[PDB]
Amino acid sequence: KDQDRKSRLMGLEALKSHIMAAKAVANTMRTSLGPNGLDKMMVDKDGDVTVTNDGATILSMMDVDHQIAKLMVELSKSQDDEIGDGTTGVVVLAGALLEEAEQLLDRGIHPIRIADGYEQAARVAIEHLDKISDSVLVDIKDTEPLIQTAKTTLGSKVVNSCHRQMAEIAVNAVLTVADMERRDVDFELIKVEGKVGGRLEDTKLIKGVIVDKDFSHPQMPKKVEDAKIAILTCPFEPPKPKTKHKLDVTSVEDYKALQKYEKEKFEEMIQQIKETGANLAICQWGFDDEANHLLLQNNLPAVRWVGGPEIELIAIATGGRIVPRFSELTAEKLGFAGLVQEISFGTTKDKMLVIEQCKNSRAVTIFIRGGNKMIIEEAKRSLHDALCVIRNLIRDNRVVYGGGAAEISCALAVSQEADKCPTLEQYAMRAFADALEVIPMALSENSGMNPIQTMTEVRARQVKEMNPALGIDCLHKGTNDMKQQHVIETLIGKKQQISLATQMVRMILKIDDIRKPGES
Amino acid sequence: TEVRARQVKEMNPALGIDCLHKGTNDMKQQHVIETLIGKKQQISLATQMVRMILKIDDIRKPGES
Amino acid sequence: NIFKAGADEERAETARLTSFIGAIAIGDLVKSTLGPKGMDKILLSSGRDASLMVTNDGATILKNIGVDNPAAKVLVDMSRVQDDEVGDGTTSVTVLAAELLREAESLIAKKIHPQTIIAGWREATKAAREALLSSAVDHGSDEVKFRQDLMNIAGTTLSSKLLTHHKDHFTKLAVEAVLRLKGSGNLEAIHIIKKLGGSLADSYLDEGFLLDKKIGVNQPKRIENAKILIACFINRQLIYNYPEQLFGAAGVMAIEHADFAGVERLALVEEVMIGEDKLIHFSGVALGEACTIVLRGATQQILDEAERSLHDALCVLAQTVKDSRTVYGGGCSEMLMAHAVTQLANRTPGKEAVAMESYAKALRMLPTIIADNAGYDSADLVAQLRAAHSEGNTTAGLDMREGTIGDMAILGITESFQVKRQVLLSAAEAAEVILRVDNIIKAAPR
Amino acid sequence: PGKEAVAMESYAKALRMLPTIIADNAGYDSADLVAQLRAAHSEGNTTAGLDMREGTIGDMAILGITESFQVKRQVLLSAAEAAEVILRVDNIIKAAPR
Amino acid sequence: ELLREAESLIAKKIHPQTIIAGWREATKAAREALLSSAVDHGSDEVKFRQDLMNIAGTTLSSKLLTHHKDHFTKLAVEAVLRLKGSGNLEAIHIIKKLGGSLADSYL
Amino acid sequence: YQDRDKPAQIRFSNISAAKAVADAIRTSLGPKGMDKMIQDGKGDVTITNDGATILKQMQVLHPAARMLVELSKAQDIEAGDGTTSVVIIAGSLLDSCTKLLQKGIHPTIISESFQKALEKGIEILTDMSRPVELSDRETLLNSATTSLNSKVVSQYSSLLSPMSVNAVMKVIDPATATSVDLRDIKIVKKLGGTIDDCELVEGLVLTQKVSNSGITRVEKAKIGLIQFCLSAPKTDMDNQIVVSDYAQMDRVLREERAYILNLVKQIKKTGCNVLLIQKSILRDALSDLALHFLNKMKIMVIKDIEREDIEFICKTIGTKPVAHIDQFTADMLGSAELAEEVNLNGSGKLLKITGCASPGKTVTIVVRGSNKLVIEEAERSIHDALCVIRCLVKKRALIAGGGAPEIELALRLTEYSRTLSGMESYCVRAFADAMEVIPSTLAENAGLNPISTVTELRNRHAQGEKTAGINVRKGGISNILEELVVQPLLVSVSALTLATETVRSILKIDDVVNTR
């Protein structure tokens, strides 16, 4: 039912309408390509405002009702896991291939034949990248050059003023949670937090877990060096419910009786802490003045009002268990850590619980500081691609010169190999060459230079001057040859860019009809 | 107003306006002098035209039908 | 079906216009308030008539007006930072930023890229910042000269305010407060009492950190060697008459009804009657460089605005003690920076020259607006200052008194260096954000 | 003086539009070539000009490009004089066709 | 271009007569700049004769003679050196006959 | 010029709205002012010529036009006369500004220029005025009497005028003090009797009755003001009274009497023999049980009194407000010699308390009359008498009426502008021409020619003095000094002072912003 007022769009006009939808998303994002990319203003539905030039953040907030655009947005969920930084390179390359395809549809070529040529040209280009690539840490694991690559990555963000410090912590973090020989770095083990105040130079690495929760009392010991941590659901006091106790005291006859039973539970459980051997007792709820008065006499620090997911992470990081009640305590359910400190922030009373391991760990949290929350927000994503830059180099130290050098070199190989394909896919291979040029031609445009003159000037330099590829000086540095500028992109990233771009073009080309029923 | 105040406050003799952007006012120094018969007929012809226009309150002209 | 049902997107052609039209509108809104001869403005909320008011404060106009455009909200938030942080330059930041975008829209019309514009403005801001640094004048010795500069800076901040008529009396109050401080510029130690009665000229002063609160019913009018315990006892909540006599029997001063600032200020810092009210006067306190300024007015609306403009003077004056450098106002600093940019335009690549030329014109439009609002021929005065600064004479400015050009040092007009510095940087940083934007995205509102 | 300063800039700005139009018709970036000549002549180098053959800036003395002094003098005077007449007019009186 | 800018100044509440006062002063400084930049040739007539070829190459630009402009730079400069008098070109005849390329022009 | 941005449209928008309010109120100027018809929304219609009443019943919505309405209220508080002349002057100055702004003059230059005319204007009026002696009660009587003849009541002025002269001279030191508080003289009135029956009481007089209290008299009373309501126990929060039997029901009555008496015992300790209960309607201000306990303590009941009536009692006897019985003390008490409630034929049940014996200078006027209107106009006339007398205390001088101050002001300001330099000349000349709207309006209402009247008077002022002004009683120009038609100096000075400040304020409006 509901055939009446059903939206429909079919025929060759639909394919050109689908291409027009993808070009709108590519032309929107090609301006934000490169370090000199133009930002994008976001107007949140709740009245909030932010500014950023991140390709992934633009696609996430872009509310597009067109179905072809939603597929292009879904590619970001698969691309950011591998590359992280240049999701724009896939959308710009996808929209470029679709624009050049529109010239081939007029010639009378089927869309599937166009997709067959791009898949053939992608293997030509992907094969070319494996040749001109270069290694950094071949056969030895080292930390000197690996830190330098991340320092150029954060320079593209607002945190460029403090890009040199965060790169060292990024290498120790990934090397801590996983070994380079294992080649298995998990982002789930990595967490990033922060708070307003200070500067980005105060970024620190905490091997363990950090939660914005304070001790049960300021008179508690500020250092739990021994590795015995109890993690209960209730505090060591008379048991209370989750919402409200509502004790019924009619007169003094009940007060002196219940106070004895209550005081007995105060002494029984507070002394049970040293029975099981636990020094620190982390609890979901807070402690009463009678409890903290007894904790101080026993030198038993404890944490109050710890959150739901915070109690879970402390058990995982310290290696303990979420104890449901004190009766289930045991030597095995006590957590492990080397030093527990309470770290305040100037005049603010945050006092986050800092659980240090005093050794190499398997999970590490990243604490960020700064004078603005949105700059701290953009600072968090600035490390996410750095984790991918480090993770990509760990999976394969082989890399290709960025700044558009790879795209211009592949375009020459794709163009020459097109002569060897006597079939209608030849026009698509030449279209793949011109589409590859849009990434570097977009960088020069965003920097304020003549695109085509800077494009072809680097082509002849890549053909006449020398065989090693040369990029575009978009930062207005001395000259080309980005190897001197140390602007190098990963090999797995460039291969996933051309791969995800060809897939996204293949999916949109094999679609030729959209149907949806309207409001009856 | 600045020239008029100079004709009272600064000095009683008349002073003009320096339209050619010369040194200053007091056109007597600049040697810019008009005939007395000129000014007498200038404001007289102007008044006579105003009276002739003020004493006209009907311009009747037949139209083409 | 790209963006429908509330969700909208402005393309590069339209978003380039909406981004500037939103920001330029806020500049042209409150540019008339610039200068001592600033034009007033009525504020009347829709749906209610009791919200009528009139003011010429560029900061007060931006706080109350609502903003739906995101480009304008950035420029307004960057202006409110100047009012809360620095206390002066809220209007110059909004005008200087908007005039830069107005010129930038003419540059992009000439097919000049926004990134090419930003490169020139970064080099111009360095040369412009270097000009103030060379022309700035500090005063380590000669406290009389340094005290005179604080009086001149106080008049500039109080210009185009409610207290502009009797500024000669308030210049002695604000400067004496900061002069008596002579150290850390914590404005917490500078209390401002507000009491009814008397004209603005009747504003008294007390160096013993006078208080705006009366205590108890029958308290001692003098206590020797009092030991302060805030929670002599001081409490924010009121003290009932029963515990008062218990403290009275112990000779403890039962202070009641303290506010948040009272606990925050008294921690670091006799009975007195000013304005028919019992006031708490301290003396010989540890770090006794504090003080209090006693305002006097007919109602509270007079005293509220008296506290705002006066606090704005204490902000820059406190900043003047931390940084004794001063620069000449009245279009001298703005025109001097604009001259260095034009000199920098001689040694620069091609497109950066045309962009830096617009940075200078935006600075020259500040005295043009100060002269236009005063009714003087701005094209004559401003163009005369160019010929003045171009051939030495780095002191000429606008004389709003007579309506001509005169040496700002002789006339006694000067402003702090950190104020003009932040005004230059906050305006350039604000306009830099708008040019980097090329497409506004609006999702379906809830 | 004040108001005369603004009029002089428009006179210089009009002269700068001549190499702008010569570069625009040739297809080169007139904003870069003309702004580079301005930066050049402002600090020495009173022989720089446009090179339409190569599409850049070069020394007119070396390349061998020059024009007569009497021609440029009359172009400057005939243009300012012609513009002076039009700028001085404020009302046009059209008479009946015969 | 002068009138295009003058139209903008009139919109800025600038009088036409005030603009003419600036253009008259500007025309003086412009002529003075030409004289300081002008370089005559009192000696070295070969350098002067070389310059006359540059005047012909600059004046003959944007014409149909671009195919053989280098030839006409010699003819026009040669015929001028024969005159050595007033600029009356009535003494200099011109012939227009078909047949042959532009480089075949005789003197 | 291009004139792309046009903020001047808001000036013409504010000037037109400001000039509109003046054009309506112009015809109602003077004794011969043409009446105006106001129709309420319900259907009622009324006729009046008082300019103050017309502005209130206009429902002005524009901001600039509201400034003229609030301006007229400032003249009433300061001077009490010339309310209509102020709005007419402001409308003409703004109308004159419309000619100057078209010439390219800035509002700031116009604003600063008008202040110079105001500074010279006050000197012109003060020089040509007539000083008088304030202690001389002969001048104050004829001054208010002749002025009250121009008011509504022309026959009973000779009775109410000297009542106000003595009331001011009594509480104000003659020829020593410069400020006067009209609130220190309360005016009570009741139906019955006639205007001839009046009493200038040296103490205070109220209107409410002390019933059902049976004391009726308390000598040597220490009057006190308590705002908290004295009654049985009451709780705003959710509560419930417990009653086990008839004994607990009757016991609560014994405990209810205690709660009323416990607060009375604390009042008895201070010696407060008379209590001023603030008027309250949200709850029982004084229950029935409180009456007998107060009668036992020999306290007079004074309740349902207005705050303004308490404000007169504040400065009269020096009583302070007490918001709670716990804060009630002896230092916050007034005084009184002999308290009593008098009930005469026409004066009604008045609370006459004499012999305050406290620092203060106050009096009170008792009034009688047949109808409400007969007593209403009596109190309205006493205010204008007190207002015009207040104008003489601050400014001991007199000036002629009929718009003669505006002609001497306009005449000499034109001579003053010839000596000035710059834009101030035309700005001050326009200030002078604007003053001519007042006498031309008086001449129009008197049936004369508006031009020839002011044109003739400008020659009589150049040759004569300010005595030449329009006399509407005779219908022509006459020597106003002989007609005894004068007004104090504060009316003409405060009019130019407050009107010019409003014009300067309206001129400084560049635009209006709608907030939310």
Side-chain angles (χ1 to χ4, degrees), chain C residues 32 40-42 240 372-374, chain F residues 106 108 326 508 510-511 513:
Chain C
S32 309
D40 294 331
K41 216 182 285 297
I42 293 160
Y240 185 54
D372 285 339
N373 296 338
Chain F
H106 209 260
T108 64
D326 287 11
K508 287 172 189 180
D510 181 37
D511 54 350
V513 188

Side-chain angles (χ1 to χ4, degrees), chain D residues 76-91:
Chain D
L76 186 75
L77 296 166
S78 297
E81 288 172 6
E84 184 172 4
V85 171
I86 307 305
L87 181 57
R88 202 175 288 181
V89 168
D90 56 347
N91 276 111

Side-chain angles (χ1 to χ4, degrees), chain A residues 390-406:
Chain A
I390 290 162
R391 176 165 183 278
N392 286 308
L393 290 162
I394 290 155
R395 287 178 76 187
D396 198 341
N397 59 75
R398 287 189 303 167
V399 289
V400 196
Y401 305 115

Side-chain angles (χ1 to χ4, degrees), chain C residues 28-29 32 37 39-46 49 52 54 61 64-65 217 240-241 372-375, chain F residues 4-5 11 14 61 63-64 66 106-109 112 326-327 505 507-516:
Chain C
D28 297 1
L29 195 77
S32 309
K37 312 303 188 187
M39 317 310 283
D40 294 331
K41 216 182 285 297
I42 293 160
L43 304 172
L44 188 68
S45 76
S46 187
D49 298 352
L52 180 61
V54 184
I61 290 154
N64 302 338
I65 184 55
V217 185
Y240 185 54
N241 300 300
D372 285 339
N373 296 338
Chain F
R4 181 248 183 161
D5 201 39
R11 291 163 193 161
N14 291 21
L61 184 57
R66 278 167 173 178
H106 209 260
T108 64
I109 291 157
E112 295 173 3
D326 287 11
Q327 319 311 326
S505 186
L507 277 156
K508 287 172 189 180
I509 308 307
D510 181 37
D511 54 350
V512 55
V513 188
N514 300 299
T515 59
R516 190 177 186 182

Side-chain angles (χ1 to χ4, degrees), chain E residues 10-11 13, chain F residues 1-3:
Chain E
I10 290 153
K13 198 148 187 173
Chain F
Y1 65 92
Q2 178 182 350
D3 269 10

Side-chain angles (χ1 to χ4, degrees), chain F residues 450-464:
Chain F
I451 316 309
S452 288
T453 307
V454 304
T455 302
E456 187 173 358
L457 287 165
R458 213 182 297 95
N459 285 49
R460 294 187 189 288
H461 281 227
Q463 299 169 6

Side-chain angles (χ1 to χ4, degrees), chain A residues 4 14 86 123 143 153-154 156 191 195 200 238 258-259 272 277 291 298 339 356 412 427 459 488:
Chain A
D4 303 279
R123 297 183 195 200
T143 65
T153 294
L154 295 166
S156 159
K191 298 295 189 207
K195 181 68 217 190
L200 291 157
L258 298 169
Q259 188 65 20
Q272 193 69 4
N298 302 293
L339 182 68
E356 311 194 353
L412 300 170
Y427 283 77
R459 285 192 211 167
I488 291 156

